Amino acid sequence: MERKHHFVLVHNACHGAWIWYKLKPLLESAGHRVTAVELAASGIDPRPIQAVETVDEYSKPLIETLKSLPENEEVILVGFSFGGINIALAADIFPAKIKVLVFLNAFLPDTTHVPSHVLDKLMEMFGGWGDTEFSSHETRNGTMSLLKMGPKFMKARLYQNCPIEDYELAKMLHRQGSFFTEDLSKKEKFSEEGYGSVQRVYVMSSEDKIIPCDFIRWMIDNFNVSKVYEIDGGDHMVMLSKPQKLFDSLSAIATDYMGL
Amino acid sequence: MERKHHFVLVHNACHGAWIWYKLKPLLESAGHRVTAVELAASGIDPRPIQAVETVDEYSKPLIETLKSLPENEEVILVGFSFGGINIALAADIFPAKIKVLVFLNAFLPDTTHVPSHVLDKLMEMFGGWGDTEFSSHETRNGTMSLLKMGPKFMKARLYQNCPIEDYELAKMLHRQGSFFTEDLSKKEKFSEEGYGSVQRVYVMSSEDKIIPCDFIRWMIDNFNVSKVYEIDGGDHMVMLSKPQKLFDSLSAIATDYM
Ligand SMILES: *N#CC(*)(*)(*)([O])C1(*)(*)=C(*)[C@@](*)(*)=[C@@](*)(*)C(*)=C1*
Ligand SMILES: O=Cc1ccccc1
Numbered sequence: 001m002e003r004k005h006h007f008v009l010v011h012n013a014c015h016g017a018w019i020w021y022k023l024k025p026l027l028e029s030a031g032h033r034v035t036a037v038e039l040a041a042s043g044i045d046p047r048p049i050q051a052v053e054t055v056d057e058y059s060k061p062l063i064e065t066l067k068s069l070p071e072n073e074e075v076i077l078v079g080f081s082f083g084g085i086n087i088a089l090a091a092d093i094f095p096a097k098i099k100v101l102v103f104l105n106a107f108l109p110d111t112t113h114v115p116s117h118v119l120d121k122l123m124e125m126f127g128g129w130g131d132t133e134f135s136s137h138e139t140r141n142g143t144m145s146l147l148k149m150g151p152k153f154m155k156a157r158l159y160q161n162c163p164i165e166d167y168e169l170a171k172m173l174h175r176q177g178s179f180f181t182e183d184l185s186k187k188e189k190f191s192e193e194g195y196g197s198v199q200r201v202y203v204m205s206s207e208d209k210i211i212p213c214d215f216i217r218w219m220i221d222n223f224n225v226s227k228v229y230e231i232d233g234g235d236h237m238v239m240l241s242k243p244q245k246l247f248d249s250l251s252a253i254a255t256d257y258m259g260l
Numbered sequence: 261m262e263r264k265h266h267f268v269l270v271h272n273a274c275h276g277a278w279i280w281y282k283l284k285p286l287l288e289s290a291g292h293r294v295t296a297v298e299l300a301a302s303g304i305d306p307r308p309i310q311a312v313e314t315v316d317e318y319s320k321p322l323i324e325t326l327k328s329l330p331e332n333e334e335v336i337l338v339g340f341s342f343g344g345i346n347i348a349l350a351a352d353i354f355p356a357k358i359k360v361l362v363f364l365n366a367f368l369p370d371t372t373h374v375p376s377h378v379l380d381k382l383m384e385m386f387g388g389w390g391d392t393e394f395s396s397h398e399t400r401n402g403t404m405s406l407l408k409m410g411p412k413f414m415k416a417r418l419y420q421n422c423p424i425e426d427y428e429l430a431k432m433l434h435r436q437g438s439f440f441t442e443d444l445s446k447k448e449k450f451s452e453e454g455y456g457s458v459q460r461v462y463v464m465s466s467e468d469k470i471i472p473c474d475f476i477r478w479m480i481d482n483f484n485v486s487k488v489y490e491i492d493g494g495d496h497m498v499m500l501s502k503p504q505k506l507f508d509s510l511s512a513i514a515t516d517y518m
């Protein structure tokens with residue numbers, strides 16, 4: 001039997017650990033270990049998003065998961081959507097606990113521009129927020145932009161290839177969230193020594209109506225990757241629409257970073 | 261077309277609206293309206309259980325859902341497990357808004373004993389809490405008993421006929437909660453004029469390892485229902501293990517209260 005791996009899964013903004021409920025047992029029946037992190041004010045975390053003012057506070061459960069790993073363990077760290085920024089933050093802290101970063105339908109930041117750069121780009125270009133509700137909360141350090149998806153938007157742009165049961169599930173669980181774009185605009189650049197040094201791949205879904213092909217190309221062109229995988233027929237919420245194929249991509253990724 | 265109904269669905273302690281994620285579209289595909297209430301300190305409600313000190317504050321989202329229905333609208337009110345208690349409290353307030361109460365693997369309280377009666381009875385005989393963590397929280401109402409299920413208990417006792425994905429999902433979402441037995445011990449008995457006047461059916465699952473069959477017969481014996489339905493092979497989380505069959509049973513109920 002080939003050596004198995006520890007996958008750490010990081011969800012998107014407005015969601016929580018729960019998105020991983022299909023993928024987790026698939027990975028584990030193959031003998032892998034899975035930790036599905038729950039980020040601050042996400043999922044059933046007890047804080048509201050208003051109380052989590054910075055992307056570091058938001059990402060803190062991921063940092064604590066990596067910190068607590070036994071000495072010399074390395075993981076496959078998968079970041080979904082805004083989870084991309086989370087995993088880059090973490091790779092800048094704990095580069096040698098990460099064997100490979102998996103950017104899954106994700107923001108892939110660079111080491112050249114401010115940390116918000118790919119988000120601000122997508123914000124200028126995205127059109128069709130639908131019933132999403134935007135607002136902001138003033139903190140002692142600046143305005144914080146918040147968002148709560150609307151359900152029409154959800155159906156059309158994130159979940160359009162998911163089983164209806166999954167759409168319904170998400171409507172009972174999604175929460176108000178943030179992309180922390182003001183905080184990220186003020187933060188020091190991601191480093192070449194930390195984040196830049198870690199191996200990285202990109203997994204894209206062919207029918208992602210959030211993160212389009214052009215925008216990925218663009219991000220990859222700013223900050224190259226080892227390898228790109230495509231999941232055929234997946235919507236943004238590929239771990240729900242096509243968990244089997246997402247499994248297949250993550251097993252391929254495990255095989256390229258084979259242990260010993 | 262047969263007249264369709266509005267089902268209001270009330271989840272169990274330590275869980276939330278999310279448990280209904282399979283049953284809701286089944287009901288909606290058949291043309292019905294569904295409201296899955298998210299009770300206080302449950303699911304993604306932003307309150308911790310420690311901030312919800314009485315069963316009345318726990319139940320408030322249900323009462324507010326019934327209160328905001330248009331006039332003369334009646335619902336099929338379905339209460340799962342401790343959700344029985346919630347729905348009984350709701351019936352004693354808005355009896356005329358409920359066509360029928362559906363006790364689903366539920367606690368069925370009576371109008372003669374203290375509201376906690378059926379829970380105190382199960383609690384005495386129940387054993388094997390497994391890895392469940394019990395704790396105490398002191399309030400201005402006296403001590404409150406809290407519980408958080410442990411994952412081995414959940415697998416064996418709630419989720420054993422569920423798909424593994426459902427079990428994993430629950431592990432990600434279940435929360436510390438309470439059966440409010442102290443508050444329910446002290447509360448005024450449910451009334452004949454409110455709760456007791458409302459039509460009620462019972463729906464039981466044949467492989468429920470929380471609520472034994474004998475316990476159910478004892479409850480119905482203290483307090484009759486119009487009719488009893490059974491879901492063959494269901495564990496306690498019958499909405500997850502046998503959603504289709506639950507749908508079948510709820511259609512049958514709806515057909516009768518046309
Ligand atoms: N309410 C209820 C039951 O589903 C239950 C809740 C927590 C633990 C065991 C049983
Ligand atoms: O996960 C993607 C996303 C997109 C828009 C709003 C919130 C989350």
Ligand SMILES: O=Cc1ccccc1
Nearest residue numbers: 119122123126179210
């Ligand atoms: O669609 C996701 C997103 C994130 C940041 C800005 C705009 C869009």
Ligand SMILES: O=Cc1ccccc1
Nearest residue numbers: 379380382383386439
């Ligand atoms: O009171 C005992 C008990 C047991 C399981 C669920 C709810 C109550």
Ligand SMILES: [C-]#N
Nearest residue numbers: 012013081082
């Ligand atoms: C998008 N998170």
